[PDB]
């Protein structure tokens with residue numbers, strides 16, 4: 001009973017629960033007990049919610065940030081359906097009233113007792129919102145398809161909820177005895193030590209004696225800082241290197257434990273391999289104790305000393321700079337700390353950075369202001385999550401201010417908040433409790449929290465923390481654990497299938513590999529594992545019956561799988577596809593697509609719809625992930641191949657794109673396609689310029705039959721090969737309706753580029769704060785400040801709106817001149 005759950009969690013999280021116990025770590029055991037109770041209490045609160053509130057948990061509303069339409073409606077236990085001519089301005093309730101009235105006339109005799117289910121999807125339409133505010137309806141309006149809904153009664157939803165139940169005295173300087181090492185390298189060994197509070201030094205780094213490569217030291221290392229001046233989040237950072245400089249390894253550790261006790265005495269530090277000091281690095285040792293170089297040290301006893309409780313802490317030209325500052329400016333800000341709190345609360349981040357964290361008096365003064373500091377906007381609170389603000393009280397304050405995040409905003413920044421877990425010092429933290437509580441209150445948040453954590457289980461520095469969080473999540477969600485295992489079983493089968501395809505593609509022809517891929521898929525174990533799951537890309541998308549005949553693979557290096565699905569209940573909306581990719585890291589593609597999706601959110605919040613294609617991309621495992629198939633689309637290169645006997649037969653290369661559009665959009669449909677092409681082109685022109693996406697060719701640009709242009713394969717961003725704006729002749733030709741000269745259409749296009757750009761510029765700090773939190777990911781192209789700088793230049797944030805739009809025209813006209 002409880003035994004099967006534990007063995008289900010182990011298989012699902014990818015780590016045995018026994019491994020947690022084998023550690024004999026009271027920090028681990030205390031996380032597990034406290035979080036289990038927390039997560040079980042979150043599960044209990046859920047079983048007592050109202051049926052609409054339960055819908056808000058399991059099926060949160062997929063909303064969008066007058067005119068009539070046909071809508072098909074049916075009731076749960078019947079095939080009989082009714083089609084109505086409703087208005088987009090109508091609310092679900094009015095639609096539910098019509099359906100109950102038409103059922104009353106047919107069946108010969110209350111709308112608040114029902115909810116509208118999207119046929120063959122894990123999506124519902126409810127709440128006081130007009131129909132055109134729903135994403136599914138909007139998808140059905142832009143394409144032209146008929147929405148299909150099922151009237152679900154309150155008791156049927158309640159049946160779902162039920163079958164888914166579970167001190168200052170120490171004035172002496174800080175010192176450490178550096179005992180000995182046990183490493184490998186070709187020279188002498190120096191052990192550089194240092195004390196840090198986040199990204200900054202609490203004193204100057206102290207080095208060890210040059211001991212030969214053939215190691216013993218037994219050397220006292222004293223730091224220029226008093227033991228009573230040690231901030232609660234003080235970090236001792238070591239670096240072992242070879243010299244005649246060659247780095248060998250690194251290790252960090254917190255001076256206080258999870259129970260606030262200043263650590264004593266002997267410690268063996270299992271070092272991590274080096275690429276010199278790494279304060280941002282994990283404060284947990286290398287779990288590969290058999291091959292890791294170790295540093296044995298001694299924490300001299302000062303006697304049990306604890307960090308003082310909050311009661312003890314609480315007991316103990318300005319405007320022209322507030323928009324990188326000199327020593328005198330820092331002193332000014334500190335003296336005026338009371339003015340900052342009262343008249344500039346949003347400048348807290350700038351005041352936290354000027355405070356002397358190496359002086360216990362200065363810290364307590366700042367902490368007394370923080371304890372009475374007013375709640376900050378989400379935008380400011382996001383800056384406070386950075387490794388640049390390590391203090392636990394500052395971290396707690398950031399969470400307190402982030403509690404007002406809507407489930408939509410939290411979902412948009414979820415990727416960033418999971419990376420911040422990597423900067424954390426202890427297992428039990430406010431961010432974890434926050435993430436878990438929000439995940440257990442929203443099944444879509446929970447789904448993506450799981451997948452962001454599961455995708456990093458093969459990374460030894462996060463495996464313990466991520467495995468512990470996932471376990472606690474499962475305790476508060478036994479039914480979801482089973483749903484996610486079904487996803488893991490399919491992904492496990494797709495891995496084996498892709499391994500076969502890789503082998504078979506080197507030994508025979510594609511029609512032979514495809515047929516045996518099909519033969520492998522038609523096996524019962526594969527038919528069952530690959531069918532009837534929630535999509536890991538989107539839990540509201542149901543991947544029902546696998547369409548073997550339609551399944552294939554791509555010709556690229558890793559031979560990615562093309563898996564098609566169909567759903568009788570969903571009709572046409574159930575015709576969905578997934579791309580299984582194994583061999584490449586999908587983290588950067590995901591980040592890039594999330595950033596484009598954010599841009600689209602921001603343009604839509606300003607009334608601008610640039611017709612973007614925000615398709616799913618999700619890393620699931622070690623160099624493994626999924627991509628959502630965008631159907632009725634092709635690469636520009638494929639359309640430009642000019643294949644014979646087709647409807648897009650072109651005399652000139654320039655005509656191929658427009659000829660393809662004309663064949664997919666005949667008559668009055670053509671003008672609509674050109675508008676879609678132009679809007680989406682402006683969006684991706686701005687997005688790729690702002691994000692610095694280079695290596696753009698006809699093979700990584702796609703078009704939908706609707707005319708919408710989109711980008712694939714984001715292997716390089718932030719100018720990593722200063723990329724210019726890009727305008728292609730083939731595109732300009734389509735924008736200009738197949739005419740050589742058309743200033744009317746081109747100046748409108750230039751306006752879309754101008755507008756899209758200035759909108760992003762106003763939210764330029766949002767992009768900067770999100771990319772700075774993403775530095776914790778370890779993406780080779782987002783590792784330092786020079787990566788962040790690219791965004792600052794492309795957005796021209798250190799300029800005025802009038803001066804930035806001029807600089808954009810300079811770059812736009814350069815791209816138009818390069819266009820043949």
Ligand SMILES: Cn1nc(-c2cnc(N)c(-n3cc(C(N)=O)cn3)n2)nc1C1(c2ccccc2)CC1
Nearest residue numbers: 552553554562615627628629630633634635712713
């Ligand atoms: C018809 N079609 N549709 C797509 C498509 C649709 N939706 C996407 N999201 C997408 N993405 C590709 C990547 C990537 N990084 O490879 C990412 N997204 N590709 N690709 C094809 C082609 C093709 C399919 C299947 C077999 C051979 C060839 C190439 C004709």
